[PDB]
Amino acid sequence: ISPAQQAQADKRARDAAAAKRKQDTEVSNAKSREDIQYTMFVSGLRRGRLNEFERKNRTDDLAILFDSVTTHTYTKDYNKSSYAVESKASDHVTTQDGKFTFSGTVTDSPYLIDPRNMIDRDTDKENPMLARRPAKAIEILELIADSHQLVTLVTEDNILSNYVITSFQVDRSSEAGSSINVQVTLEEFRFKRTSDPKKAKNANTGTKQTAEDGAVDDSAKQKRQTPYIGKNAETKERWENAAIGTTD
Amino acid sequence: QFKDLLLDPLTGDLDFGTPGDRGMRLALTNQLSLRQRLYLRFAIWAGDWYFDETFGFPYRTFVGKKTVKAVLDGRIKSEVRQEPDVLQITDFQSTMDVVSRSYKCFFTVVTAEGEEISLAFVGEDEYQYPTPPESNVQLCGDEGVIINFKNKLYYLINFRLPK
Amino acid sequence: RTVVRTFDFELSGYPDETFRVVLDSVTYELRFMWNERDESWFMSLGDIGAQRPTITSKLTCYSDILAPYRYLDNVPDGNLYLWPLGDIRTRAGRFNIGPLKGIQMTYSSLIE
Amino acid sequence: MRAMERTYTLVIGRPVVIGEKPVNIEKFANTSKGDAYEIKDLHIEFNVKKDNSKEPNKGYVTVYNLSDEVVNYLSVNQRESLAVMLHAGYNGDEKLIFSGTVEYVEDDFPEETRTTKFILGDGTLNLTTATTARSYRKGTPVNSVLNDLIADLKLPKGRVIDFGNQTLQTSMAFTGNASQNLANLAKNTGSTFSVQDGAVYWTKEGSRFNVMFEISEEGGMVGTPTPKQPSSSKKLIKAHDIKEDVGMTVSTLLNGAILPESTVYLNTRYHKGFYKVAELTHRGGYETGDWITELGLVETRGELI
Amino acid sequence: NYGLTGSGFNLPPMDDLVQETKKTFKSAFGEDFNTESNSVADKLIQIFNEREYQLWLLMGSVYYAQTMQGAEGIYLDDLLGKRGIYRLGKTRSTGTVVMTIDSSVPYNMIYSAATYTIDTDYELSSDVQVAGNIVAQLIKGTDVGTYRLQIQNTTDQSVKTLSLNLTATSGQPLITFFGQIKDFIVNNTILSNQDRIWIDSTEGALYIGYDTNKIMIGLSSRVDFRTNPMAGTRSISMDVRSIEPGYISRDVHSVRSINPTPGGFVDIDNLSAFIDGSDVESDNEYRIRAATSISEGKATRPAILAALLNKVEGIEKVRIFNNNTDKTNSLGIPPYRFMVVCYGGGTAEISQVLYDTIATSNNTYGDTFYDITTDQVERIWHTKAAARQLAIRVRYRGRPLSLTEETAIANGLATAVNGTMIAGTLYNVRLVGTVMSSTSPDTQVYVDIKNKGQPDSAYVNTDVTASTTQVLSLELEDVIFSQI
Amino acid sequence: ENYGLTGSGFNLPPMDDLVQETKKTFKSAFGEDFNTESNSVADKLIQI
Amino acid sequence: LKDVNHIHPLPDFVRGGFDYVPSDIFSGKENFEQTLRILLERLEFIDQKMVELAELRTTLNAEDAILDEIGRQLGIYRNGLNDPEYRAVIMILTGNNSKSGTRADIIATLKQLFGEDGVTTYKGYNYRLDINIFNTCMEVTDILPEIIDMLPLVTHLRVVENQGY
């Protein structure tokens, strides 16, 4: 070995570590703000669903439209006891979470570039292929799934809410070049501070200990006491030490 | 609302202020704070600041190499959204000149403004504690009760007579 | 009456917080209620699982809360005070209570 | 918009040393370096049972793929009792769920994944080594004997119900472990003694303490309550009458702000009323598994102490 | 449950009241009555209910208004009014400033109080005269001729004069002239002053009221001093107050300007932090002041003794005497008047401190007086002890002491300057102990003491006692040693 | 120069003085018209 | 910018609550409004009296019927005093507990009873002190006993009262 390599291993570690700080940071802030609401438009649009598509702005109610959706399926499940009941005892049944899946595609040669779509936030009007639209979609897709957003689906018949993404697939086969096939799967979510005191309810926090690195917690960790900034050291000083004392 | 030392947008040094009120200032408005937070984030080349190897922008990847305009714009537009208080990016005019080999982009960012939560650490107080009375006014009354009554009587005498 | 600082408190601002704390090796349960018109915190103190709180009082800065109540077997004998870290004129608020929020609610115990 | 995701924290501190004053596991959290070894984002499986009896409450924990430094710190101190605290909740707060000493620790690292194991005891060291030697004569007030023995045990007094003007009928002598002697006084006076999360609780059987907790579909209940006998055997009866003998069972999402000696109100569509608590079991699988708590309730027939 | 209980006053939430009143309505019209969402009765009852929440909150606020905690605003005054403490109103900042003046400004010129402003918010406290307020002086270089020197004695009131000739403008003659001036000044005022005046022979300049680093620190007190040829640059001390009451603060070296510049002005600066003004008193500091009132003692002999020692830029020693029986007593004192003796406390500044005296206690005896405005104006009296210097000779048997080794012994006898007025007894045994202490261990030692100027026959060993108004003193140069 | 070991002994500067010349030299680089009074942002930084 | 004392009548109490009518469904029907107004306006009276129950109990404004209760707690009985001066004695005695009888101090206490220029004090060599009154607003003989109490143990006092200079 030689120092020339030590100046090279550091580069290998530094650049690789920088990748997490980018990806890992973005998800953190994406979860630190609940105002944004994502929505997806699978079919539906031209049969009067435009009434609510126009409601979507470019800052809070982001909308996603795929260049084409081939199929989408919706299904629910139930189960019942397999043993004869004692007799009416109609409570021997349970409801499972409904599933939703669909297949789509994103192409380098779009036919409709409506700017309201969040995929086309800043896409060039005259050169769609240099905008690299398929890469734009994937970057959006991972962030939504990673942050665990409660997505809302607008479909042909009904509207579904509180659906989370559990898996998706992307591939670029030899056929259909210059495009990507996308599959998604979603399931229901049976979800159940600054608040109005009139809405407040008695809460609990269990047993609690010394809170945060304070003037007393510092002593426990052997940290040196934080010096006091001398904005005023004439009034409190005579009283602070006499009445509150010092950690010792 | 992130507080920090104010940086002069015109020179880059600390904003000590005008010659009439020279001193030191803190960045209070969210606009000013975000401006310098983006400025420092873009001005520091990646890896060049000790104590943090992951901070900065990797200019060395693009400068001096044959690069595609579209790839650069993505990275430029991505670093901006690392701040948690950025609402959106409005427009982006990326242009490249092949003769001079220069690249120059334009864009703007929109950010809201928040509240101050607490004024305890900044300057003033919002309360209006009362003022002690003066002299024997408390135990014997006040003359203003006479002055106000006299003024009311005078103004009422003024009102009735047409003018 | 020598006394030593031995505990500090923090409040999340929720108007009906309730939690259990241990002081002087004894355990107590505390309730904090926020008053809108009077913009002040109301503190109730009592034993664990007690039917009713033993003490109820209004929190204020530089006032000895427990002063008139050191004659009961279930009340701490220490000192409970609220004093500010910033400008001395700041009064207790909703979100400004904590080790670094502006107001330092603290408990100190006599040396025995 | 977010989801409702689990969170937890695990802390390891200095060795616990018993002295001449009540032991508080809180003050041992800080290590010689200051801040303690905190473990947050690693798949963890734990099981913590609690009860109101002589035996301490014990909880089990498992952690996968720990860093070598942390394991090294536990290879040392294998002769000593490290203090440990556990927290759990939902993405906005974490309630204390267990605190004690590391009774056991072992590591197995077959090929792909290491798996650390723990066994924790709630005050095991004090309850099993606190010796006593006391005596009293005829006429001594029983209320004095109780306080004398508890101070020997060297633990904070969570809650006690004094006997009043009761007096000993015969001379008494006590030796051996203090906990054992106190547990014997329980039988002959209808009182329940049990240490929990460092707190000593002395109450009276049959009676109960307000609605400190309410269970309903809004309160994250899981399934309907079902009646389950509170003991695995039946006693002969004259058919003290005040004693227990009945109970029920309920399950709920994890909530560490509950203790065996507390009182709960059951607001369901079939069952309604007040019950005591008798047993707790906390389970948890961070990446995969349940995040719930199970309560064993017992009916009460005494006065409202 | 939520009203008045055995442990104070509680607060009910909204939902409990809503449920209670809905239960009442249910009972009114049976279990079938609807009370949720769509009922007109629901819209009336819920709207009605929220108002009594305000009433309950206000009632709860009222109850604590009469308790040690919870009182606020006007109600707070009544609680602490029972203990005779009242809030402080608007206050005006107070402080003192100094300025250097050109050599040419005449002594008798008097600054008009109402024609100057220090800065945007400061003005002269009162009329100021240049004479009698000199605090520091600097003389350097350019000054042959005959010079007159004047000084008012700080103990007596007799003006003293000195005559000298500056035959040379540099060199040893100039050094000797400066030394003569130093000896002239030190013989009056206080010995502490000599520590703050010296000569920089390398530059041939004289510094008055400075430190070794050439920083004007001022003399021990304001004085009067003049030279017929007005040489060097003079400095004076002024008293300053703010224009309007309020909050304002200034640091130790903040003041830097005067708007109307007077002729001959040189510079201006601070010496110590001002007593900052304050706005209307707030509740927190009101409680703090109420808490710390224990130490507030006044109008008692221990209280007056303590106050003087902590309120004067000096006052090294103080003692009091009493005569209250129908007669003047041995010590010359009127029948019912106190006696206060001080050292190095000035006249005006100390006089103001004496307003802690018990009302109707005449006091007011001494050799010096001053008048203070209350309104009515009253005069107070006191005296300053007359220092008496001693001459000390040391004889011993042992190895000869080397030069610069006697410094420890000489400074060791500084304890001789710690004697108290009247009740000052040397206890030569104490001196023997001290001289044998401020040195390396190790045969014979003796101490002889006599008043300055007396012949060598006056040396004795018996202890000396201070007079009624005299206090012991000693100079480093007045120590001698002899080997035996 | 009057700080540290000096042969006659050891001299320690108090808290207050160190601020005084730090502000003085700091003021020298920007002139008198430079706020450094109590609670000012610049003063707060100097104290730390 | 804001008063610290939050105990005040709620501003515009009546129009509040009416603001909670959902979507003007009932507004302009003149049958539901009167029923609601009649009930709410009752709380107005109670809300108003909540203040006087606290305001009037302060010693500054307390009427004689209850001022006696305040004095009783402090041991200052009415005796033959009347309301206007009974208030004064209560203040004087209470204020005495933090006093030292200095010349500056004595002027301060007399300041609250005779305005700014209504009092002056001469001093004498042998414990003599004099009090002058110019603008008395109450009869002084009944107040006199207290005026002695806040003076040193050995004071020699004269009292002279007149109107004007």
> Which residues does residue D275 pair with via DSSP β-bridges, in sequence order?
D264
| G2 contacts on B by Cβ (under 8 Å) | 126-128
Q: Is A58 on the interface with B (CB under 8 A)?
A: yes
Resolution, given in Å to one decimal, reads 12.7
* Tokens of residue C66, six digits: 């427990």
Residue whose token pair is 């060097």: E232
DSSP E164: E
CA of A248 to nearest chain F CA: how many angstroms apart?
Answer: 23
Name the residue among E230, E149, E217, E215 with its Cα closest to residue E187. E149
CB count within 10 Å of CB E451 equals: 11
Contact D267, D199 (CB under 8 A): no
> Rounded distance, CA E86 to CA E290, Å?
9
* Tokens of residue E35, six digits: 């009370």
Q: Between the CA of residue D237 and those of D234, D240, D299, E79, G125, what are the distances in Å?
A: 9, 10, 17, 65, 100
Residue whose token pair is 């984002």: D41
Q: Do C27 and D199 touch (CB under 8 A)?
A: yes
Of C26, C27, C51, the CB nearest to D210: C51
CA of A186 to nearest chain D CA: how many angstroms apart?
Answer: 14
**Contacts (Cβ under 8 Å, ≥6 apart) of A243:** C3, C79, C81, C108, E291
Contact E128, E238 (CB under 8 A): yes
Residue whose token pair is 């923090």: C10
* Tokens of residue E376, six digits: 């009515």
b/e per residue, G48-59, with b = 16+ CB within 10 A?
eebeeebbebbb
Q: Which residues of C touch G (CB under 8 A)?
A: 37-39, 91
Which amino acid would we find at residue B11? T
**Contacts (Cβ under 8 Å, ≥6 apart) of E443:** E396, E397, E398
Residue A125 is inside which H or E element, if any? none
Task: Identify from G1, G4, G5, G6 which residue to disrupt to test chain C contact, counting C C-beta atoms within 10 A and taking the largest count.
Answer: G6
One DSSP character per residue, E112-161 reads: -GGG-EEETTEEESS-EESTT-EEEEEEES----EEEEEEE-SSS--EEE
> Rounded distance, CA E342 to CA E420, Å?
11
CB count within 10 Å of CB G13 equals: 17
Residue C41, burial from CB neighbour count under 10 angstroms (0-12, 13-18, 19+): buried
> Rounded distance, CA B17 to CA A221, Å?
42
Of A203, A210, A247, the CB nearest to C4: A247
Report helix, strand or coil for D295. Answer: strand
Q: Between the CA of residue E386 and those of E182, E317, E469, what are the distances in Å?
A: 20, 12, 6
Contact D204, D190 (CB under 8 A): yes
> Rounded distance, CA E241 to CA E118, Å?
9
Task: Identify from G4, G86, G112 which residue to disrupt to test chain B contact, counting B C-beta atoms within 10 A and taking the largest count.
Answer: G112
**Contacts (Cβ under 8 Å, ≥6 apart) of B49:** B55, B56
Count of CA atoms in the C-beta half-sphere (13 A) of B76: 21
DSSP D83: E
Name the residue among E96, E91, E89 with its Cα closest to residue E125. E96
CA of E8 to nearest chain C CA: how many angstroms apart?
Answer: 5
The vertex-D303 CA angle with D297 and E3, nearest 5°, equals 95
Residue F11 is inside which H or E element, if any? strand F10-11
Q: Is C96 on the interface with A (CB under 8 A)?
A: no
Contact E372, E380 (CB under 8 A): yes
What is the widest separation between alpha-carbon atoms in chain D? Answer: 71
Q: Is C112 on the interface with D (CB under 8 A)?
A: no
Q: Do A135 and B92 touch (CB under 8 A)?
A: no
| G91 contacts on B by Cβ (under 8 Å) | 139
Count of CA atoms in the C-beta half-sphere (13 A) of G51: 11
CA of E361 to nearest chain A CA: how many angstroms apart?
Answer: 32
Q: Least CA distance to E282: which residue of chain C?
A: C89
Chain C, 57-86: which have a CB under 8 Å from a chain A CB? 62, 79, 81, 83, 86
Q: Do G137 and B136 touch (CB under 8 A)?
A: yes
> Which residues does residue D99 pair with via DSSP β-bridges, in sequence order?
D85
Q: Do C88 and A194 touch (CB under 8 A)?
A: no
Q: Is A234 on the interface with F (CB under 8 A)?
A: no
Q: Is D41 on the interface with A (CB under 8 A)?
A: no
> Rounded distance, CA E410 to CA B47, Å?
67
Of B23, B25, B26, the CB nearest to F34: B23
Chain F, 8-47: which have a CB under 8 Å from a chain B CB? 30-31, 33-36, 39-42, 45
> Rounded distance, CA E127 to CA E239, Å?
9
CB count within 10 Å of CB E17 equals: 16
b/e per residue, D97-120, with b = 16+ CB within 10 A?
bbbbbbeebeeeeeeeeeebebbb
> Rounded distance, CA E366 to CA C66, Å?
53
DSSP E83: T
Phi, psi of G85 (to 5 degrees): -90, -25
> Rounded distance, CA C108 to CA D186, Å?
36
| Chain B meets chain D (3+ C-beta pairs below 8 A) | no
Q: Measured in whole angstroms, how far is the alpha carbon of residue F37 from the centre of its chain?
A: 13
Phi, psi of A33 (to 5 degrees): -140, 115
Contact A210, A218 (CB under 8 A): no
Counted residue by residue, chain G has a size of: 165
Listed in sequence order, the DSSP H helices in chain A are 3-31, 50-53, 133-146, 217-220, 235-243
* Tokens of residue G77, six digits: 């009985």
* Tokens of residue E91, six digits: 């206050």
User: Hey, CA dihedral for A50, A52, A53, A54, is it positive or negative?
Assistant: positive
Name the residue among E348, E146, E312 with its Cα closest to residue E229. E146
CB count within 10 Å of CB E431 equals: 20
Q: Do C63 and E288 touch (CB under 8 A)?
A: no
Q: Show which subunits contact A, needing at least 3 CB pairs below 8 angstroms.
A: B, C, D, E, F
> Rounded distance, CA G117 to CA E376, Å?
12
CB count within 10 Å of CB E136 equals: 21
Contact D164, D142 (CB under 8 A): no
| F32 contacts on E by Cβ (under 8 Å) | 256
> Rounded distance, CA E471 to CA E155, Å?
13
Contact A155, A186 (CB under 8 A): no
Q: Measured in whole angstroms, how far is the alpha carbon of residue B7 from the centre of its chain?
A: 11
Q: Show which subunits contact C, needing at least 3 CB pairs below 8 angstroms.
A: A, B, D, E, G
> Rounded distance, CA D48 to CA D60, Å?
6
Q: Do A231 and C62 touch (CB under 8 A)?
A: no
One DSSP character per residue, G57-124 reads: TSTTT--HHHHHHHHHHHT---TT--HHHHHHHHHHHHHGGG----HHHHHHHHHTTSTTTSEEEEE-
Residue E335, burial from CB neighbour count under 10 angstroms (0-12, 13-18, 19+): middle
Contact B107, B93 (CB under 8 A): yes
Q: Between the CA of residue E217 and those of E135, E197, E208, E212, E266, what are the distances in Å?
A: 9, 11, 9, 10, 17
CB count within 10 Å of CB E246 equals: 15
Q: Show which subunits contact B, needing at least 3 CB pairs below 8 angstroms.
A: A, C, E, F, G
| Chain D meets chain F (3+ C-beta pairs below 8 A) | no
Contact F18, F26 (CB under 8 A): no
Name the residue among D230, D211, D224 with its Cα closest to residue D52. D230
**Contacts (Cβ under 8 Å, ≥6 apart) of B150:** none
CA of C36 to nearest chain B CA: how many angstroms apart?
Answer: 17
| Chain F meets chain G (3+ C-beta pairs below 8 A) | no
| B110 contacts on A by Cβ (under 8 Å) | 59
CB count within 10 Å of CB E251 equals: 17
Phi, psi of E403 (to 5 degrees): -60, 145
Q: In chain G, how many H helices and how many E strands?
A: 6, 3
> Rounded distance, CA E286 to CA G161, Å?
36
> Rounded distance, CA E294 to CA G98, Å?
10
- Strands E479-483 and E386-397 turn out to be parallel
Q: Is D5 on the interface with A (CB under 8 A)?
A: yes
> Rounded distance, CA D145 to CA D165, Å?
12
Q: Least CA distance to D157: which residue of chain C?
A: C26
| B78 contacts on A by Cβ (under 8 Å) | 22
Strand stretches in chain C, DSSP E: 3-8, 16-23, 26-35, 40-46, 55-58, 79-84, 103-110
Q: Do F48 and A229 touch (CB under 8 A)?
A: yes
Contact D68, D296 (CB under 8 A): no
Contact G149, E84 (CB under 8 A): no
CA of B12 to nearest chain E CA: how many angstroms apart?
Answer: 30
Q: Is D207 on the interface with C (CB under 8 A)?
A: no
Q: Is F24 on the interface with A (CB under 8 A)?
A: no
Conformation bin of residue E324: beta by default, left when phi > 0, alpha when psi is -120 to 50? alpha
- Strands G156-161 and E146-152 turn out to be unpaired
Residue E342 is inside which H or E element, if any? strand E339-343
Name the residue among C27, E180, A162 with its Cα closest to residue D22. C27
The dihedral over CA atoms of G28, G31, G36, G42, expressed in degrees to the nearest 10, equals 120
Q: Which long-range contacts (C-beta less than 8 Å, at least 24 apart) are formed by E157-166?
A: E157/E368, E160/E184, E160/E188
**Contacts (Cβ under 8 Å, ≥6 apart) of E287:** C61, C62, C63, E80
Report helix, strand or coil for G43. Answer: helix
Counted residue by residue, chain C has a size of: 112
Q: Least CA distance to F44: which residue of chain A?
A: A229
> Which residues does residue B114 pair with via DSSP β-bridges, in sequence order?
none
CA of A227 to nearest chain F CA: how many angstroms apart?
Answer: 8
**Contacts (Cβ under 8 Å, ≥6 apart) of D274:** D208, D211, D263, D264, D265, D266, D300
Q: Measured in whole angstroms, how far is the alpha carbon of residue B138 from the centre of its chain?
A: 47
DSSP E418: G
| C98 contacts on A by Cβ (under 8 Å) | 211-212
Residue F22 is inside which H or E element, if any? helix F15-28
Q: Do C102 and B117 touch (CB under 8 A)?
A: no
Chain F, 3-42: which have a CB under 8 Å from a chain E CB? 20, 24, 32, 36-38
Contact D57, D196 (CB under 8 A): yes
Count of CA atoms in the C-beta half-sphere (13 A) of B108: 5
Q: Do B127 and G113 touch (CB under 8 A)?
A: no
* Tokens of residue A11, six digits: 């580069």
Name the residue among E333, E343, E360 with its Cα closest to residue E309. E343
Residue whose token pair is 């120059």: B104
Contact D64, D115 (CB under 8 A): yes
Q: Least CA distance to F37: which residue of chain B?
A: B23
Q: Measured in whole angstroms, how far is the alpha carbon of residue E346 from the centre of its chain?
A: 11
CB count within 10 Å of CB C30 equals: 16
User: Hey, CA dihedral for E458, E459, E463, E464, is it positive or negative?
Assistant: positive
One DSSP character per residue, A141-210 reads: HHHHHHTT--EEEE-SS-EEEEEEEEEEEEE--SSSTTEEEEEEEEEE--------GGG-------B--S
Name the residue among D267, D273, D270 with its Cα closest to residue D299. D273
Q: Which long-range contacts (C-beta less than 8 Å, at least 24 apart) are formed by E348-355?
A: E349/E312, E349/E313, E350/E308, E350/E312, E350/E315, E350/E382, E351/E380, E351/E382, E353/E307, E353/E308, E353/E311, E353/E312, E354/E380, E354/E382, E355/G102, E355/G103, E355/G104
Residue whose token pair is 């409601």: A55
Residue E158, burial from CB neighbour count under 10 angstroms (0-12, 13-18, 19+): exposed
DSSP E398: S
CA of A197 to nearest chain B CA: how many angstroms apart?
Answer: 18
